[PDB]
């Protein structure tokens, strides 16, 4: 299927280059831009919570060290977190795909930063919200109603988790930084490589 | 320059060969014997930590022992020298912890920074000369500490290493996707 005798004038050739340096950008570098883009506002979003979570966690019970959590205003929170990105997928960045391409990006993506979901006949690569998900879980298994007490056994349990899920999502947006970090890079050497034969 | 000219794809093909040898040679094997060499002068480093059981003397003479084990063994370039401005941008590549640039004559290189096994001497003279089961382990924090240090400049080298990897492979995926 290589054909060496295939000629082209440099004209050609350079026309050639751009038209495909222009496709890398628009369907590879352009979409992860939008990807790291999108997480790192959620994650941003997310983070407003966290600070939230100061004014719902206070000293509770009698003496002594019990954590009253005002668990009902951090799950409306949450909620309200997963309700602002279910439109806000990481791929693309408007309108739908088909799945083979949607399941394309999430391969590269990855299966834990991203979840295939269909939106309308299409497709996109939503926001994976699971650990999200998992702290609202942890939060409805304190049972309670609304507001909870928590000695000091049952807080660090709880905080344990809901900081791991927290860790998780900066685990995933650093591996999303470097691998557009990364992409950025393959462009520039295919540029240099197709560059170079011009020299 | 003449846009009439014609070039065959078997002409291409050498072309970009000719590129992608070129980045192996200037810049993964460039990064790999950087690995090379701060890798083995850690791994000598950790001889002279494991060997702490046996003083001060002792730990002198293996801790310059290293320092001129390393002098003529830069993390760039392997062999000779190249000017300021390339041993520059390969410090600001591997970072200006792990390295330092240093003008030989006939050029410049970017050898191992030694600052962590200076920084341990600093302290080794500071305190005196016995040290009681108090500040013998205040003292053993801050060497312990250096080691740290040391092994996470390793660590953050290798991570771009294999970052480096990483952009050669998906560079040669993507010009052989059609083949
Ligand atoms: C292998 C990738 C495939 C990227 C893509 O999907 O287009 C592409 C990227 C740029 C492409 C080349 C562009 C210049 C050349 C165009 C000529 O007509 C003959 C083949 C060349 C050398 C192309 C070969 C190859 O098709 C390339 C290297
Ligand atoms: C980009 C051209 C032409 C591709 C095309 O015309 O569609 C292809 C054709 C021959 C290809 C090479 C063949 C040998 C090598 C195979 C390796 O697994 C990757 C590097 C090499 C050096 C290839 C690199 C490159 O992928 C080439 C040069």
Redesign the interface.
């Given at each position: 299927?290589?054909?060496?005798?295939?000629?082209?004038?440099?004209?050609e050739?350079?026309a050639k280059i751009a038209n495909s340096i222009n496709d890398?950008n628009e369907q590879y570098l352009k979409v992860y831009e939008h990807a790291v883009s999108s997480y790192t506002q959620m994650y941003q979003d997310f983070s407003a919570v966290l600070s939230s979570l100061a004014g719902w966690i206070s000293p509770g019970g009698n003496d002594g060290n019990s954590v009253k959590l005002q668990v009902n205003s951090l799950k409306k929170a949450l909620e309200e977190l997963k309700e602002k990105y279910k439109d806000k997928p990481l791929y693309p960045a408007n309108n739908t795909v088909s799945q083979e391409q949607a399941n394309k990006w999430l391969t590269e993506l990855g299966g834990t930063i991203g979840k295939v979901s269909q939106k309308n006949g299409g497709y996109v690569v939503s926001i994976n919200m699971t650990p999200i998900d998992n702290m609202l879980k942890s939060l409805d298994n304190l049972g309670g109603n609304g507001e909870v007490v928590l000695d000091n056994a049952k807080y660090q349990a709880w905080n344990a988790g809901f900081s791991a899920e927290d860790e998780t999502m900066k685990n995933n947006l650093q591996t999303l930084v470097?691998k557009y970090?990364?992409?950025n890079?393959?462009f520039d050497?295919?540029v240099?490589?197709l560059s170079?034969?011009i020299?």
């Open positions: 299927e290589l054909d060496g005798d295939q000629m082209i004038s440099h004209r050739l350079w890398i470097q970090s990364n992409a890079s393959i050497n295919l240099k490589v170079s034969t020299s």
